[PDB]
């Protein structure tokens with residue numbers, strides 16, 4: 001399944017993921033493509049930060065959804 | 078009852094709906110007025126993107142509410 | 154910046170994460 005990720009510089013990358021892929025696997029793909037260590041990735045979808053141990057389905061992420069990569073905020077995790 | 082749908086260009090569409098109407102039903106009513114296929118519509122209300130398969134009543138959308146229409150590219 | 158509250162876009166109402174500075178739905182800036 002394709003999903004999009006808006007990266008830190010404003011470009012958009014496309015990932016091929018399983019329909020219920022884990023968030024950890026998604027971060028692993030982003031690391032390979034963009035170079036960001038998974039521990040430094042913070043992904044937002046539908047106003048929520050995506051969590052390890054969940055899958056894309058937990059968030060109703062589907063074909064051609066767009067996720068946003070962001071920095072860690074002070075006071076955030 | 079009437080609800081209102083505001084476009085991002087600031088037009089307000091008036092719709093005639095019922096609490097049991099589905100979000101898809103509402104999108105079809107928007108298509109009748111605006112020509113926009115339902116698969117190009119996102120509706121936002123009270124901070125939430127509304128899901129097809131739910132009703133207005135599931136979202137507590139009461140009379141005279143305003144929804145916001147955000148366009149999208151049709152998903153493939 | 155700092156973590157703070159989710160914010161409702163004044164254009165479309167969507168409830169956005171504080172790490173985003175433009176609305177996830179309609180791209181309007183939070184601050185104007």
Ligand SMILES: [Zn+2]
Nearest residue numbers: 162165176179
């Ligand atoms: Zn918005």
